[PDB]
Symmetry: C6
Subunit: 30 residues, 6 copies
């Protein structure tokens, strides 16, 4: 139901943030 749908979107938000962290690490390296 709905509480699970909410947790799923939080998952998808963490996933985007991980990709943000990697782009920044690339930038910090060059």
């Amino acid at each position: 139901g709905e509480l699970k749908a909410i947790a799923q979107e939080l998952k998808a938000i963490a996933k985007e943030l991980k990709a943000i962290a990697f782009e920044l690490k690339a930038i910090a390296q060059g």
Copy 2:
């Protein structure tokens, strides 16, 4: 239902993070 409304705003937040990751990838490419 407001619980569905909450999940939808979270999905929209994920969408914006997706766009942020793309722009940072572009900057890393500099």
Copy 3:
């Protein structure tokens, strides 16, 4: 009520993320 207020706050958060994506687009435009 309160679940609505939570959703309205997530929408404001999404709005801020839009502006962040926009400035990042500007910075990418190097």
Copy 4:
């Protein structure tokens, strides 16, 4: 109670994101 405390922290998150947007605008300008 608790649902209000949650909305309050979402407020404080949006506030930090607004300050992030302004720092990025400054960077996009110079």
Copy 5:
């Protein structure tokens, strides 16, 4: 209660955004 636990994680997320805003302010100072 898990609702208190949720508010606490949100506060911790706000703390991290605070640190992100500081570092960006430092970069804007370049």
Copy 6:
């Protein structure tokens, strides 16, 4: 249960934001 899963996802999100703050600190170190 489900509210716990929501909180555990917010904690993972906080963890990603820590790494973002760290890379930004590195970039600030210009």
